[PDB]
Every structure is written in C-alpha cells, then in structure tokens.
A and B are shown apart, each in its own frame.
Chain A
C-alpha cells in the first residue's frame, strides 16, 4: 500500500476540487477519521478505513457551503429576473388570470415512464374572466360538479390523452368551448 492522501493533504485546500461528484465515502480520500457504529461494551465506535456503513451513508461531502457558493457563482449566469408583478395574489391574478397544473414525478432507475405524471388541471376565476352573467348561469349549469361556492375557482381536470402538451391543449380547448357554448344562447332557455 501507500501512505494515504488523508495525511498527505494539508489545510487551506479546495474541497470542490477534491470531490466534484456525488461519490461514496472513500475514507482514504476523506481527511476525517469518521467512526461509525454501536461500540462494544469496553470499546470505541469502529474505525474509518473499512466501514460498510460509512459507504452506505448518502455521503453529503461533495456539497459544502463554499461549494454551493462558488458553484452558484458559476450558475449565476443562467437566470433572468421577475417583472413588477408584485407579491400580491390579486395583482398577479389580474395580470395573468388562468392557473394550470402540470407536474412531473421523478423516479430513479432505468425508465422515466410515470403515466400519472401527465395529469393536468386548470383553475380559472370568473371574477377575472369578467364577461359572464347569464353566461355564468349557463356555465354553472354546465359544470355543476365543480365550482365550489366559497371561492370563485373553476377546476377542469384532464387525464384522457397521453401527452402533457395535448393535456394542456385539452384544458385550454375546454375553457374556450365552454366559454363559447355558455355564450351561445339556446332556444329552450326560457322554459326553465
């Protein structure tokens, strides 16, 4: 063997240079005598050089606060900033009415096929749509099962088509054709 780099290294060295990647422990690389385990009755926690449990630990050594700081000095390029849309929820609702739900479910393995990850659902405000009176009456009568009374939120779900973008298309299509059929006056409305 060789006298290891654990005592070859000295102070004032760059741990982002030492550990770039998420890696298992490697106690020879680690300059820290980490002791793991339930000790024996007249003994110490067992040593550093051969610890299966220290290799089993998720090992957040590669992410130290100076590594976050320098790394995001590198990442500070990849960002713009927000406009003055304000922290106010009514302000951002006025600026941008509709709210669409489209998420992802990240697994870990060979395949990235989580089908439920295509679920999409749209919430819109009638007080921000602003253009429905007997159209809003007809609208509620169309979608009875949604639109709870306490908050003026319309929630339309789609899980009918495999792709997330055409699920978004289904959502916006239902919004516009519910709107158009609500504004389409029918001949049997008066005999209510």
Chain B
C-alpha cells in the first residue's frame, strides 16, 4: 500500500511572507527604502521626507520622459509580456469624429478634448 499524499498548492507569495516572518523588523536598522550609506543617511524626519520626495520626483521624471519618447522602449525582451513595464500612450490615436474616439479620450481623461469633439 502506497500512502501517496495530495500536493498542497500555493501562490508565488506565501514563501516570501514566511520569509518576512523569519525576518521580523531590525531594531537597529533603518527602513529599507533609504540606502545603507552613512553619508546617504537621513538624520531627521524632514531630511527623510526630502529624500523620499526626491526619489518620487526622479520616478515621475523618467515616467514623463519615457511617455514623451515611447519609441525608444518598444523593444520588449522580457518574457512574459509586462504591460506595466510597457510605456503608456496618452495621445488620442483615433482622429476621425467617432464614438470610439470619444471612449478613447474619456479613457485618456482629456476633458477639453472630449468636450470639443462631443
């Protein structure tokens, strides 16, 4: 007789959650968003907020430049396809006066453009 067990199935997340439970918080270490250099260390809450807003600034920096020039990032190498790594298009691709263009401009949230072509 073989007592063959049934395979318990998970997601991709529970192993890393158990890993976080293994690593509870470090009482001597700073939050991991900041770097680990003593010179790059924020000393005050205001300095930490300034560093965080600088990081968010640089993030939307590249968001603006990449959405401004989507042709230089169309070559995908990663498999599977990653739409949130794919750049976003904000210009209306539908030019004729149509309900499809209205839905496209509504999804792009262009208020004056939608009102004008309505």
Q: Which of B19, B24, B38 interacts with A17 by CB under 8 Å?
A: B24
Contact partner, B23, options A16, A28, A78, A111, Cβ 8 Å: A16
Give Cα A70 to B28, complex, Å: 20
Interface size on B, residues (CB 8 A): 30
With A18-B26, A71-B22 in contact, do A83 and B39 touch (Cβ < 8 Å)?
Answer: no
C-alpha gap A110/B77 in the complex (Å):
6
Number of A-B contacts (CB under 8 A): 74
Contacts of A192 in B (CB 8 A): none
- A112 touches B (CB below 8 Å): yes
From B2, B5, B38, contact of A4 by CB (8 A): B38
Name the one of B8, B15, B26 contacting A75, with C-beta atoms under 8 angstroms: B15
Which of B14, B25, B27, B37 is packed against the most chain A CB atoms within 10 Å?
Answer: B37
Residue of A with least CB distance to B7: A80
- Closest residue of chain B to A95 (Cβ to Cβ) is B2
A4, B22: Cα distance in complex, Å: 25
B residues in contact (CB < 8 Å) with A = 1-5, 7-8, 10, 14-15, 18-19, 21-29, 36-39, 41, 43, 77-79
A/B interface sample: 8 pairs, CB < 8 A = A1-B39, A8-B28, A71-B22, A74-B19, A78-B14, A84-B2, A110-B79, A111-B77
